[PDB]
């Protein structure tokens, strides 16, 4: 029901631009959600006040027929799996529809995503410039205060 990375929709990372997140840490910038690398993060703040949910906004190089992002985990740490998100677009970055709410399993332990690739998510074929992901569950050391996101991957025409 889904699409695998080799779909003919697949766009291309050098069409996606992330022009804002909730916050940023450390090294892990918002733009290494769709840098197209697996070893690269966006991660949020994880000072005192900081908390759930945060979220960040890919711009796409025109207006697309958007119907499937993909989630990639933090390869190498569990910190800031998101297990409960939201998806919004917009054509104009200020008006925007409320595509989906879901969740993505965890393993047995309760401790990471159950799938540590590709996590598919579909929704309905909207078109749009932007897209707003939000974390609203996630893991970690402490669970429910940051997110991270190793890619998103965007299908559409
Ligand atoms: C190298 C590494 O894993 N850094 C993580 C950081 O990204 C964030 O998750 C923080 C919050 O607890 O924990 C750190 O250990
Ligand atoms: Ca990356």
Do not use: C, M
């Amino acid at each position: 029901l889904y699409k695998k990375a080799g779909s003919e929709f697949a766009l291309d990372s050098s069409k996606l631009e992330a022009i804002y997140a909730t916050s940023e840490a450390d090294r892990d910038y918002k733009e290494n959600a769709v840098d197209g690398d697996e070893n690269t993060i966006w991660h949020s703040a994880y000072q005192a006040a900081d908390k759930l949910p945060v979220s960040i906004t890919i711009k796409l190089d025109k207006a697309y027929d958007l119907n499937q992002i993909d989630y990639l985990p933090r390869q190498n740490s569990r910190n800031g799996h998101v297990t409960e998100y939201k998806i919004e677009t917009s054509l104009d970055n200020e008006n925007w529809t409320e595509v989906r709410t879901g969740n993505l399993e965890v393993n047995e332990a309760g401790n990471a995503l159950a799938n540590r690739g590709y996590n598919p998510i579909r929704f309905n074929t909207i078109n749009a410039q932007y897209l707003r992901f939000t974390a609203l569950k996630t893991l970690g050391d402490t669970n429910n205060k940051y997110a991270s996101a190793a890619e998103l991957v965007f299908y559409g025409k």
